Structures are given as C-alpha cells and as structure tokens.
Design a protein around this nucleic acid. Structure first.
Lengths: 31, 1040, 54, 114
RNA sequence: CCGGCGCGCG
C-alpha cells in the first residue's frame, strides 16, 4: 500500500526525452 | 512497443519529430523562384540553409503571460538584380513554428492545444455496386486521389461507361481516354472486350477522337457544360489541369500503392500519378467483375483508411503558409520595382504568413482542441482520439449508418467500447493501448508469431496492418489443454477473414498475448471488466474523465496495473532528467545534483486548470536518496506514489435504506463530510480588460462613486482586490470607470471564496496606450454535499440525497458504521457485476494491508478465476485479523449488519466492502439557477438564455402541448405574454404583485408577434388582425 | 453525546492566505493548520480558552 | 543535451584485460550477464543503482557471456549472475560473488574489501 | 445580447 512505482522497471518504456532537448540532440535546432 | 506498453504520447511525439525532419524540407521546397514579369529581379530561397532556433520565451513563461510557444525559422534567400549583376544573400525571417511539449500539447496565446488524429478514406480504386429502382445491379469503380478527388466509373443500363465527375457532368470513357491521347486503336487491344467500347462509337464521337485536340475540346464541353465551341489554348489546359488534373489525377505514394495491389499492377513505386493504363485496367475489372470475377471492396475496412497525425496537419498548414508568403513577396517585389529601388531580401519577406496561419490554425481548426486538464487521465486520452469529422471528413448528418459500427479490422487498433455520446456516436474513436501508426497512415497492433522449426525469427513480435490482418489465423486462447493425443490438435477460438473459427493449434499463425491489447486507456482502468456489460464500460470510461482531484489523494486498493502507466505519461508527477542524489526538498522546489550537474525543479502550488480544478505537487523523495534518470521525484494532483489516484476507499453497504437511495440516490455519512474525504479545491479566473473609447481610455481606481466602503473594503490603492481577501457575492474585484459610468468587475453569484492570485500586467504594443489585463483567481473549498455526483469505475453513478450522523448509519459486526449505502437494485438492470468483486476485494486488502493490480480477463487461466481470488483473499483477511464476519461460509461476501437507529440486525446478510468511489465535476453550486426578472433580448425582447446571463427557462412547444392537454389556458397565456415578451404587461405585473392588486389580461400582442409582422412586411406581405363584434358586427383593427 | 476539547481557530501574522508558504518552514500554512487540527486535548470545562505557540 | 539512461558500460574481454592491466585508482566491479537470464534483469537494475551511488569512486562494467563465453569460463564463472570485485591494489585478490546479492552487500564489499 | 465551430450532461 505504501509502494512507490519504479519507473525504470522492466514493464516501463524508456524515459521520455525532453522534446526541445531531443531536437537539439539530433542537431535539428540551433541554440 | 514490442515488449512493453508504449508511451501514451508516443504517437504525438513521433509525429512532430517527423514533421521537423522531413516536413519542413519537403515543404520549404516547392517554393517558386519568384521572378518579376520583366524577369529583372529574381527572388529565391536556399532551402538547405533552413534553421530553427530554440524559443526565447520559456515554456512556463509562454502560458504565464498568454504567449505562444514557438521557434524562429531563419532560411536564407538570394535576390538577383540583373540590372547590377550582384548577389545579396541574408538570413531572412520567415516566421514562427509552434513547438510541441514533451506531453504532446502546443501552447498558443497561453492556451494548451491538442491536435487530434483524423480518419478518412484511403486513396486508391474502390469497387461498389448499388441497386437501381427496378433492382438491376449497377457496378461502379471509384478513383480516390491524395486530396479526396473522386473519379467515378459507372456502367449504365446500356452498358455505356461514363466517367462521372459531378451530379450532372457526364463524360464517356473514350472521350476521356482520347483526351490524354489514347488512340482509339490501342484502347480496344488492351481490354478483353473491344466490342463493347466500339458499339458506343457514334459518328460524332469518332471524328473528335481521331485527333487529340478535338477530344480535349469535347471533354471540356462535357465537363464544363458551357454552350459554344472552345478554342484550344495553353491556358485552357492549365485551367483544366488545376481543376481536373491537379485534384483528380495525382494519387500520391499511398494512392499508387493501393492501385498496384487492387488492380494487380507491377508499376514502380515512384510513379505518384494516375497512369492512363490504370483507367483502362480498371475498366477491365469493372466489366469483368460483373460476371462473377472478384469481390466488392469493403469501404468500412480499415485497410481502406488513413490516419492523419499532427505531422500531416502541421505540414499541410506549412503548404498554406509558404503559398501565402509568395503572394506577399510578389506584391512586395512589384511594389519596390516600380520605385526602381534595391530592396534587401529581409524587407521582401514578412513573418505574418507563417505566424498568422499557425496562430489561426489552432484557434479555428476543429481538429485543434483545448487540452482537457480536469485530471491526469483527461490530459493523455484527449490526444489519442480518432475522428471521422473535420475538413475532408463526413458530418453527423452526412455519416452513413453502416459507419458508426464495429468492423473486424478494428481489433487491436480502434477500441470497440470508447465512443462519443450523442449525434457523434461511432464517429469519434480512440486508439488502443498497444496501437501504433504505421508509415502508410495505417494503424498497427503487435501479434506474436508462431513459426516452424527451421526459422530464425529473431523477433517474433510483428506489428500488423489491417490489410494483412485478415489473412492470418489469429488465436486468443491458451495452450492449457491436453488429452490422450498431442497438444497441437487441441482446438481454440481464432479469427480469420473477419470471422470467428475453432481450429487446431497447428493451424494458428499469430497469437494475441497482450492483456490491454484491444482497449483504450479509459476501459483499461476498470478492474474485473469482464464481469461488466459492455454498455456500462462505455459509461464508466466517460465518468473517470469527470473525476475531480481531491485535496488529499490515496491509491486504490484494487486496480488493473495501468495506473502507474497513466501517472508516468501524464507529466503531473516530477520525473528526474538526470541521475544523482537528493540534497534539498521543500514545497517550492526540489534540488537534485548528479555528475557535477546540480538542477533545481520547481513544484506547482495551487494552480488552475481550464476546468477550474486545482493543480498541486508534493515531494516524494527525501534528502540523501540516490535517483536514476527517469524515476519519480514528486507527486502531483490525483497522483500518489506514481499512480493515478482519482478517488477514495470508503466503507460501503449495498441495501435499500428508507427510500433515500431510491433509483440512483446515494446515502452517505457525516464522516465523509467532517473528515474532508471528498473535499476538492476549485479555482475560478476573472479577467477585466482596459479599452480606449472615444471619450478616453478606461481608468482603474479605488475611488468609485455611488458605492459603499463595505463593497470596496478589499481593494488596494490601485483599485484591485487585495491578495488574500475573502470576497463575497456582489463584492468588487477590479474598480473601473468608463467616461464616468461604473464598469467595474464584480464577483458573480455563488463565487464567494479566497483570492489567491492577482496579475496586473500590461501588454506592450505599438500604440500610445497599452491594454492592461487583470486576472483574479479565487479558490473555493468544496466539501461533499447533497446533490453532488459520485461514481465507481463500473458505470455505477449516483447523486447524494441524504447525509446521516455516524450513529444513524448501519454498522458492521465490528461496530464500524458504513460511509455509503448503495441501492442493490442497480446491479441487475445495469448488469455490472464487477463492482461486487471490487468491493469485497477492497475490504480484504484493507485488512491484509495489501493492494491488488489485476489484469483483465483473468478467467483465461481457469474458470471462476476472479471468484477464487476474491474468496480466498476474503478468507485470508478473516483468518488473520480474527474477523469471522469478513468471510461467511454460508454466504461469502455478505454479512449481517445492524440498524444504527434500533440496534437490531437487518434480516438478510448484506454485501459490504471498501470500493473506490470518485467525485465528479457535475455538482450543485454550478447548476442551481433562479430568476425573477431582469434583462431581455434586444430583438425578441424575451428573457435571456443561460445561467451565467441570469436568463430564464424556456417553455418549448412540447411544454405548450402539455399545458394544452391540461386545459390550463391562463397558465399558458402567462408564459406567452407577460412573463416573456409583452413589454407593457411585464412592467404592470411587476407593479401589481408588489401591491397585491390583481393582474389583468394583456389583451394586446406580444413583441414576438409584432416582430413577425414587420418581417412579413419586408416580403411585401401585410398581416392584419381584425376583431368582429358579436353585438353590432363592427370590424375592429387590432394595433399590429 | 460525549464531548471533547479541540483547537478551533489559529491566528497567524505574516500570511496572505492559508494557501501560501513561509520561508524556512518546511510545511505550508495549510499543512500547519492540518497538523493543528490533529492535536488531541483534554478538559472538563467549557468556554473559548486560548493558548499560545511562541 | 539528453543524458544517457544507463551508466554501466559493456566491455569486451580484451578491453577488460586492458582495464585490469592498467593503473586503477577506484575499485572495479565486473558483471557477467546474459540477456536470456531472468535474474540478470534485477541484477542490472541493482548495478545501475550502485553506479548511481558510486559516481566516481567505483567503476561498474558488464561482460556478456554470449560474446565472451570462453573468457567467462576462464575467469571461473559457474553461473549467472556473477560479480567480480577487483581491488585497485594488484597485491590484493579479487572477490567473486554468486547470486542476487543485496545492494548493501555490494556496498560493504566495496567499502571494506577493495 | 449576433451567428457559426468544437466539447460535453440528462
């Protein structure tokens, strides 16, 4: 009843990246 | 999504990223190299130099001060002055491109917006046959282009083929075929029936066919229905090409794909135009199918559909944006040329085309909607909707009755339960949990492949489009069955060719193994859903979207295990973006430091949604705790420990109690009131704007004439209500004077509360006066009351009609009174048995200190799987806690309870438990309305419409029929003349009733009849009302 | 029918409204009020007595 | 701009040999795992947490036995999950732990044995 | 104080 959900567990997708940071990471938006 | 449930916003996330990569480049092309008529000045864009820069305003700032979250577009242009033969290239400014949030929503003018997906008929060739008046079968083949252009090929009674374009414009195939240049010789050889085409060759058509141009002119005559002989010209073909070839002959990449399949053609993919062979090949099947060769096309099949995401909608508006820019430049280059000046490339292009067409796309387009922020469940399900409506789609009146039905191609792609209620039923869908949008606009769901021994099969999870869905034998059963034979010969239910079979395992290709495969988020939050009738599942999904976040939240004892998925993908909780350690925590912020990177995460404190619901976050970690990237840091509203928490676990009995739970009424205890179990915060926003009038701009001041100091007691020196003041109905919020009449902002009826936020802000503009805006936010603590609506997750809704003291409620054998009493008669008619399972298991979990997250359809393991789970957990709680009433061997789940008023037991055992009950937005204090008199409409002079406008109630024609059925002719006249629109008689009724001196008959016409007479006068018609005296037969003209 | 003694009204000094924070205090005003509501007192007498937290 | 989701790095047998040969300041923790092994998922999560805890004071690496089966057999690996705690001092001897040991046990080994 | 569009409730 007091369990905290572990979002890095085997039943979860990969952490959702920041959209702006994802765009900048792939070199699509300049600073 | 091969091995886990995918992100609920992954379709929005991937669509927008596709637009950035390929949508911009594919649309920045096609931009014409703009040249003047003289060809002197040539303006062009260098699309390979296009760039986007990160927005200058932060995403929090964009919504805070009503801005738009967008990024700059900075392509480069080259202007050619052949007069000087010199080139100038500069980084010109094109516009602002809105940016999608990680949650999948845009921000325009400080308003969250969501772009929903659309369903429409996929391009290709479609074969249909419709009966005529006499029942003679008439076949038809229809070409659908990339823009909805329909080219109908029809067979008439005389077997003559006509390429119908409109309801009247009819053109033969030979003229159309020879319009493009198909010589009459080769048309006959490429079909199996040269005779049929030759039989319809009148001597007039042959001469026009013989030459290419005469076919074009005749085709124009039949297509345009214009009297006279047109002259062949280059402009005529271009005019026809835009109207006909541009809209009815470009298939596209998808359109070519289907035509190659349905017409069985080996044509290269790159050919995105309707080749002339396709038309001639289509006529072969069309005539050939008339003789039993083939099958008709299923129009409701999902393999004949496409899905347009935010990628297609944002790219299309860019097609309008740049086409709107070229018309701006053409006027600009022509204007500067007439002045013989050399304009810099920046001054030839303004940012209005891109910025405005995106500003007006979210504002006006039906597929762009305001994000619903009632609770975390509404934030994510709104973005996953599929609609047949919108531009290019059928309307509710337009919608066919065979549509709105469930098609076998929907399984795993469109939820069969979730749909809208009302006229739009069956037209607004919802994506399944595991559904994915393919690369052809088709929906895909994952299936597990069973293959032979000699096959690698590295990944056996393959996503299946509806086109290939039919031709696989897909089973949903299990392999827990053995007889004296072998396992491969055991039979299981399966799907094949849109039907349900029962075949052996050795003939099964794919298995459906995911538990939430066929459902949407709403239906996937219902525990024991397989015991509820599917009719209530639709209602239950809607009610969960209306749940109000409570001032304190708690997790459900019984769930499905999807609550953690909903919490993660909603963005309401705080999720770490970097691994590290927790160093500091408080209400306003959480400080996380990891790998020499120290971040500070602010927490939302008592913020307002678009639905007047409070948003609030509390920390979920302590100082000194190590954190992984992607793990929870804090809990938001309606979220506990990383799970969706929309309700409370309360003690509940299912019995009738003295008629106070009659029909759907709910009897509750005072403990739910003074315990603040169902207390919610509600925040309204009141805005006032300052405008510049002819007499002068509006002024804001504390000093207001003809007002008491008691009303203005909460104002500051500037004239605005003080932060942290308890306002009242009729109190003053913003004191404003219009030259000066009082035009101040007052608190409406029932809005009493505490002022929590004031925003005195100026919008900087190019005028000498800047519009001042004031926003007052008022919190209202609403405990549960009589008339509020509560519901469970099984379609069990009800109104609170009675609140009792705890000593009056029925109580259990441990002496505890129950909190709610529900009518047991609501189960058999509503056929939702899953609520009986949940309440018994919720009681067991509370005693055992356990929570349960149960996937649906647990009877796939064994018969009565839910019964064994609930009964064994009820007995475990009974045995461990020494509470023999919790599990009764005589009648499991039911126990004898006692009357709180007499102490005597009720005769029959009562099913008791601890279910999960939600509090809904539909409640009193937002629905109670009253009116004596007041403001009336300007034209009809009838009382206004709406509770917010202090309007009256309408007595429609069906209510007039009832009054005529009773014969109450004087009640009817009151509601027709001097309570609605008889201006003279309304003022006399107000006077007589205050002196109590009898109301006389109006005897004159109301303003609605006089309004009709004038309108009839405007049509040169006179309508006179005459009274003929029965005494002397004198005709009297009534004033009208 | 059994009566009890409880805290019914608390007065602050530098608070705009009960939905705000105090710098250096981990709990907001709302949490402080909720904690004050949970204090169990005992008394045999009636009347509106006042206490002090300083 | 986007941080990586995993801090434990996968190394080859040759890369691990070079790492062990070279000068080491912090303890080196070598994990042997296989993706088909059920217990290795929990060990993977535990080692991610351990890597988060020991930012620069330890080095966590993993070796897949489906790529270095002979190397794992040489290193006296009898099953999965198997951990090797290698001290920075060459004079001392490494510690092999077999099974899903607790995170506190890993912390104790690193603190008081490496 | 006027109409369209979208979303809902019974």
């Amino acid at each position: 009843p007091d369990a905290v959900m572990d979002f890095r567990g085997p039943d979860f997708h990969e952490p959702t990246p920041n959209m702006l940071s994802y765009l900048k990471e792939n070199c699509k938006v300049i600073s | 999504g091969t091995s886990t449930i995918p992100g609920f916003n992954q379709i929005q996330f991937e669509g927008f990223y596709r637009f950035i990569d390929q949508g911009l480049i594919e649309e920045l092309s096609k931009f014409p190299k703009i040249e003047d008529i003289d060809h002197e000045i040539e303006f062009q864009l260098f699309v390979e130099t296009y760039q986007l820069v990160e927005p200058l305003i932060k995403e929090r700032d964009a919504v805070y001060e009503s801005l738009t979250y967008s990024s700059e577009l900075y392509v480069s242009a080259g202007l050619i002055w052949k007069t000087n033969r010199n080139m100038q290239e500069q980084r010109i400014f094109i516009g602002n491109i809105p940016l999608m949030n990680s949650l999948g929503t845009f921000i325009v003018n400080g308003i969250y917006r969501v772009v929903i997906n659309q369903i429409l008929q996929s391009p290709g060739i479609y074969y249909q046959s419709e009966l005529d008046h006499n029942g003679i079968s008439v076949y038809t083949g229809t070409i659908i282009s990339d823009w909805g252009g329909r080219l109908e090929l029809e067979i008439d009674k005389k077997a003559r083929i006509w390429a119908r374009v409109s309801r009247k414009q009819k053109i033969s195939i030979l003229v159309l075929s020879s319009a493009m240049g198909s010589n009459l010789r080769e048309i006959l050889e490429n079909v199996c029936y040269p005779e049929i085409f030759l039989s319809f060759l009148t001597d007039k058509e042959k001469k026009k066919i013989g030459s290419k141009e005469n076919a074009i002119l005749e085709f124009y005559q039949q297509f345009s229905c214009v009297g006279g002989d047109p002259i062949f010209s280059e402009s005529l073909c271009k005019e026809l090409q835009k109207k006909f070839f541009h809209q009815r002959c470009e298939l596209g990449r998808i359109g070519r794909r289907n035509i190659n399949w349905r017409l069985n053609l080996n044509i290269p993919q790159n050919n995105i135009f309707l080749l002339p062979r396709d038309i001639l090949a289509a006529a072969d099947h069309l005539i050939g199918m008339k003789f039993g060769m083939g099958t008709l096309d299923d129009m409701n099949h999902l393999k004949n559909k496409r899905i347009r995401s935010v990628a297609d909608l944002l790219q299309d508006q860019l097609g309008l944006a740049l086409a709107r820019l070229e018309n701006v430049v053409k006027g600009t280059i022509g204007g500067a040329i007439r002045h013989k000046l050399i304009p810099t490339p920046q001054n030839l292009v303004t940012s209005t085309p891109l910025t405005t067409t995106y500003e007006s796309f979210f504002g006006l387009h039906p597929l762009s909607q305001v994000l619903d922020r009632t609770n975390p469940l509404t934030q994510i399900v709104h973005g996953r909707k599929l609609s047949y409506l919108g531009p290019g789609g059928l309307t509710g009146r337009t919608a066919n009755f065979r549509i709105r039905d469930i098609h076998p191609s929907h399984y795993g792609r469109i939820c069969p339960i979730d749909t809208s209620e009302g006229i739009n039923v069956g037209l607004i869908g919802s994506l399944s949990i595991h559904a994915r949008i393919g690369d052809w606009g088709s929906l895909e769901s994952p299936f597990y492949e069973l293959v032979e021994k000699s096959k690698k099969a590295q990944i056996r999870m393959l996503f299946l489009s509806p086109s290939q869905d039919e031709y696989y034998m897909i089973a949903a059963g299990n392999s827990l069955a053995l007889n004296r034979g072998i396992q491969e010969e055991q039979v299981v239910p399966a799907r094949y060719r849109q039907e349900f079979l029962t075949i052996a395992w050795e003939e099964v290709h794919l298995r459906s193994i995911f538990p939430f495969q066929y459902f949407s988020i709403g239906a996937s939050l219902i525990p024991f859903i397989e015991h509820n009738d599917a009719n209530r599942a639709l209602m239950s999904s809607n009610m969960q979207r209306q749940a109000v976040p409570l001032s304190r939240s708690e997790k459900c004892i019984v769930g499905t295990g999807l609550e953690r998925q909903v919490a993660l993908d909603s963005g309401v909780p705080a999720i770490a973006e970097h691994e590290g350690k927790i160093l500091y925590t408080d209400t306003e912020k959480i400080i996380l430091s990891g790998n020499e990177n120290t971040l500070s995460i602010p927490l939302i404190m008592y913020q307002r949604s678009n639905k007047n619901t409070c948003m609030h976050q509390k920390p979920q970690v302590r100082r000194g705790k190590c954190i992984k990237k992607g793990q929870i840091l804090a809990d938001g509203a309606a979220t506990v420990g990383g799970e969706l928490a929309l309700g409370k676990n309360v003690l509940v009995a299912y019995m009738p109690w003295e008629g106070y739970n009659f029909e759907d009424a709910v009897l509750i205890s005072e403990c739910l009131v003074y315990g603040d179990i169902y207390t919610s915060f509600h925040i309204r926003k009141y805005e006032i704007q300052t405008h510049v009038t002819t007499q002068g701009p509006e002024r804001i001041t504390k000093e207001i004439p003809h007002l008491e100091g008691r009303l203005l007691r909460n104002l500051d020196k500037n004239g605005i209500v003080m932060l942290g003041s308890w306002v009242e109905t009729g109190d003053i919020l913003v004191g404003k004077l219009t030259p000066s009449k009082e035009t101040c902002l007052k608190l409406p009826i029932g809005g009493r509360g505490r002022v929590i936020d004031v925003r005195w802000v100026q919008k900087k503009g190019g005028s000498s006066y800047n519009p001042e805006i004031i926003r007052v936010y008022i919190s209202q603590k609403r405990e549960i009351k009589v008339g509020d609506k509560v519901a469970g997750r099984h379609g069990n809704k009800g109104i609170i009609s009675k609140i009792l003291p705890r000593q009056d409620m029925p109580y259990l054998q441990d002496g505890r009174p129950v909190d709610m009493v529900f009518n047991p008669l609501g189960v058999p008619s509503r056929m939702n048995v899953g609520q009986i399972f949940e309440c018994s298991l919720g009681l067991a979990g509370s005693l055992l200190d356990r929570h349960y997250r149960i996937a649906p359809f647990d009877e796939r393991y064994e018969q009565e799987a839910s019964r064994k789970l609930v009964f064994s957990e009820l007995y475990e709680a009974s045995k461990q806690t020494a509470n023999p009433w919790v599990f009764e061997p005589e009648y499991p789940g039911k126990s004898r309870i006692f009357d709180g008023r007499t102490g005597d037991p009720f005769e029959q055992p009562v099913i008791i438990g601890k279910p999960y009950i939600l509090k809904l937005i539909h409640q009193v204090d937002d629905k109670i309305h009253g009116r004596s008199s007041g403001h009336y409409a300007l034209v009809t002079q009838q009382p206004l419409r709406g509770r917010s406008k202090q309007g009256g109630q309408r007595v429609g024609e069906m209510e007039v029929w009832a009054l005529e059925g009773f014969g109450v002719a004087h009640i009817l006249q009151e509601m027709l003349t001097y309570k609605s629109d008889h201006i003279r008689a309304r003022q006399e009724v107000l006077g007589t009733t205050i002196i109590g001196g009898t109301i006389p008959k109006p005897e004159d016409a109301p303003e609605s009849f006089r309004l009709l007479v004038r309108e009839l006068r405007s049509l040169a018609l006179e309508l006179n009302h005459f009274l003929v005296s029965e005494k002397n037969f004198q005709i009297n003209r009534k004033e009208v | 029918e059994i009566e009890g003694t409880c805290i019914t009204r608390a007065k602050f000094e530098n608070i705009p409204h009960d939905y705000s924070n105090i710098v250096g205090i981990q709990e907001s005003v709302h949490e402080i009020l909720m904690n004050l509501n949970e204090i169990v007192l005992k008394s045999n007498l009636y009347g509106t007595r006042n206490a002090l937290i300083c | 701009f986007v941080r990586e989701d995993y801090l434990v790095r996968k190394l080859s047998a040759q890369e691990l040999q070079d790492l062990v040969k070279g000068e080491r300041k912090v303890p080196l923790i070598v994990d042997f795992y296989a993706t088909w092994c059920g217990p290795c998922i929990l060990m993977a999560q535990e080692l991610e947490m351990l890597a988060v805890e020991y930012e620069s004071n330890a080095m966590i690496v993993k070796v897949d036995t489906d790529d270095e089966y002979e190397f794992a057999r040489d290193m006296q690996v009898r099953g999965l999950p198997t951990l090797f705690f290698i001290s920075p001092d060459p004079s001392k001897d490494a510690i092999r732990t077999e099974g899903l040991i607790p995170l506190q046990m890993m912390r104790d080994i690193i603190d008081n044995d490496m």
